[PDB]
Design a protein around this ligand. Structure first.
Ligand code: HEM
Ligand code: HEM
Ligand code: HEM
Ligand code: HEM
Ligand code: HEM
Ligand code: HEM
Lengths: 147, 147, 147, 147, 147, 147
């Protein structure tokens, strides 16, 4: 709740260029968990390398979608239960596409990584903790989709 | 069932040189999930790098075994319950050797990858879907081995 | 000269979002030649991983500079001797920063890679050849900087 | 129990320089499962590359802690129930820090890898089996922490 | 000359399945020098990942060609000057395709690697030395192509 | 010369545990230039992966040798011509073992990387510059070995 400001202020920097920042998050994600790459299947084809995904307009569009859902979480940072229904169904989608629930922890690490690299000295441990708890709440809501 | 032909016709190309095609599938598998490499323990030793596994006659023999089980699935594409018992026990084996059930999804992605690269324009989305469902059925049967 | 049109038409697609396309080229470059990463030294620090470079405003600014020099080459596709002086000095710069001349061949491969992935079916072998020869001419001019 | 000697004798070599050997185990671990790297969060920061973790005094200190817990397992090789309580709580810790139980299988593979490379011809299949069963017992005790 | 037998006897094992062994050599080559991958340009396209090259009939055909040139070197192990002309022109080819002379040292390391993994205990240091000198002589002849 | 103190003070931290710091430098080196790994040939065998080199007592011994030569450069920071003869012959050695002169630039980047990670805030750009120039002088002397 004091850290709701910490979320708000830190997100301001990154929301100004969501694709550039989102591309950091996804490049980091594939570096940590390369087995996620085949799950982005567009026009019946699999990306061979992570740099392949960055040439795909559909993949970059998904980066934008991801950033908009995080942006919705920031907007509702003070009460995330308003998004529970939407997030539950987003979890069910991703379950359908083949994402394991556990892969969302790597996503969280990739989000925290992108924030640390963007904010530098401004990524205080209280900012880390706040984002950890906001992201934790998002994934909690999403996890409902897996049962 | 119409796609049983799609399975049959597409497999014809790859079954003519099963080791060459199987080597693609396994090179792709280790690229996506490097932590599978230590599970192939022959003569009490661990492969250091994926290219090490390709020099091992026992490892290449396992590639041939893998291709023969897929070949059996194609032969019984129209009724896979004939193989359920064999596949259940194959799952129990792999559980014993240390493979997590979830790793079989990466195997599926590696199989679809090898088929896409071998068939090129001939890997139609209906062919993708058919193989996804055949492979899904194989792993369903195998998953019984984990309980 | 007929292929000067091939250059012009193919570049139109990519010049509309130069950073997005340039990010493909650089991600590919570091995947092929990871030893280039330490040469981008901003504020006395070295990037640890390729995804680190994508969070750096200075690094992304260099991507934009790269795309503008290629854009100048396209503008002068019909007579590149107008840029020889500028390109010679750009080569001398890069020599100073520690880039080996030979690394520019990997850059060429990364440029052709980004074009192939962006143009798909539109990247005809005549388009490949044209870009190979335009890029070859740019590097020829730049190579003067190394003596 | 005869292999309790096999454990004892084989550990003697490695316990003389625990950090050097532990560094092998961890370099191998990150090579197999790169997604573990962000879990070592010291001073609110994430390591970008595995070589980053090797410059961290806190990370090297954790290597030493790891080796001391294995050393305790060797000391109690003949009766591991004396360590059950300590190990259960160590599991609960690691659960808290974000380690999935399943990641401990990769740790086991990394431990067996380091032992094979250190012992060479001396890593007999009976030595492999003994360490597999000792490590299996340690993780069994630790797994209690996850429920 | 005594080691001409060492060459002959050691090559016998590998020449029985040249593609399988050649695939080890090339997988190792791309692992050491990933920047070689774009040089294999078939039908105007670049392989994204090393596992892509293993699905390409043209790439596997080149593996077979490579093994046949080494096989010719073994046949003329006692007098390599008979192949100088052929090898000089093979060097000129490869120069044309964009291979740097220096990359042939990595090839040598990949050849020695494949031999070590295939021969195991049979890869004696005298066998290593013999192959080093045979390969050195082949590349010496090839190096003429670069001037 | 004022920066001779900058060299001296910064080296003090790292010389207290030369193997630990040297292991960072070499892990970084293989991450940037994997093709260097086969050049460390001990007992006629090639390391498959970088983590293999860290289990080798001979390889770790070479890390110690490397650190002692740098330590000699620091001791003679105020007049490096005293070491020219020794360094020239060290260059001739390395030429013999198969190291290309150009690979020593990657070594320099790996040394600067290890220093940055060890010194953190203490690695000022004047400290970077000083080490760049000291290392540059060492390699200049070594380069004599290549002609
Ligand atoms: C584990 C990493 C992830 C993977 C592999 C993944 C994959 C996918 C796939 C396959 C689709 C369907 C195809 C498409 O619409 O592009 C999709 C859609 C979508 N994703 Fe992701 N995703 C990941 C993480 C996320 C995250 C973290 C968010 C935001 C919090 C997100 C937001 C969205 C949205 C908004 C859609 C479109 C929604 C719809 O059609 O109902 N994704 N994702
Ligand atoms: C996740 C990837 C896989 C791994 C790590 C793996 C590993 C192993 C291991 C350790 C063995 C025992 C040693 C040996 O016989 O070589 C084995 C045996 C075998 N595997 Fe796999 N395997 C994988 C996937 C597959 C697949 C997908 C198939 C076919 C659908 C398959 C078919 C076989 C067969 C037929 C045997 C011998 C059967 C027996 O002894 O009862 N394997 N595998
Ligand atoms: C081998 C890959 C390359 C590397 C490692 C590299 C590195 C650098 C570095 C260190 C600088 C100085 C710092 C900076 O201004 O950001 C720089 C500047 C610059 N680069 Fe690159 N570069 C590469 C390729 C290119 C290419 C292919 C182009 C365009 C054809 C290009 C265009 C520029 C421009 C326009 C500048 C600023 C010019 C100036 O200050 O005079 N670079 N590059
Ligand atoms: C999966 C690989 C592992 C990861 C990611 C991991 C991570 C961590 C983390 C984050 C901490 C807390 C911060 C710290 O104290 O450094 C920790 C502490 C610790 N770890 Fe590990 N660890 C792993 C494996 C192990 C193993 C295998 C052992 C020994 C069997 C071990 C022994 C310890 C000990 C003794 C502590 C301090 C205990 C305490 O504070 O109560 N760790 N580890
Ligand atoms: C550095 C690694 C190498 C690369 C990147 C490479 C690449 C190529 C390329 C691009 C071609 C032309 C396209 C083709 O015919 O497939 C080729 C042809 C060929 N290569 Fe290689 N090559 C390498 C090593 C070798 C080696 C070591 C040998 C045997 C000693 C070899 C034997 C051949 C032969 C016999 C041909 C066909 C000859 C001709 O058309 O005149 N290559 N290679
Ligand atoms: C490019 C990275 C390097 C590689 C691949 C490399 C490789 C080798 C090899 C193969 C040997 C012979 C076998 C052995 O004695 O272990 C050696 C010896 C040695 N190296 Fe390195 N080396 C590298 C960098 C360095 C550096 C930077 C230094 C110190 C500045 C150094 C200092 C030494 C010393 C003192 C010896 C023993 C000297 C002798 O026998 O005359 N090495 N190195």
């Amino acid at each position: 709740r004091p850290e709701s400001e910490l979320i708000r202020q830190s997100w301001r920097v990154v929301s100004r260029s969501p694709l550039e920042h989102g591309t950091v998050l996804f490049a980091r994600l594939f570096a940590l968990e390369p087995s996620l790459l085949p799950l982005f299947q567009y026009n019946g084809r699999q990306f061979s390398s992570p740099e392949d995904s960055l040439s795909s307009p559909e993949f970059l569009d998904h980066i934008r979608k991801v950033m908009l859902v995080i942006d919705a979480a920031v907007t509702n940072v003070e009460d995330l239960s308003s998004l529970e229904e939407y997030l539950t169904s987003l979890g069910r989608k991703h379950r359908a596409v083949g994402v394991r629930l556990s892969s969302f922890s790597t996503v969280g690490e990739s989000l925290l990584y992108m924030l640390e690299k963007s904010l530098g000295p401004d990524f205080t441990p209280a900012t880390r903790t706040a984002w950890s708890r906001l992201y934790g709440a998002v994934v909690q809501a999403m996890s409902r989709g897996w049962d």
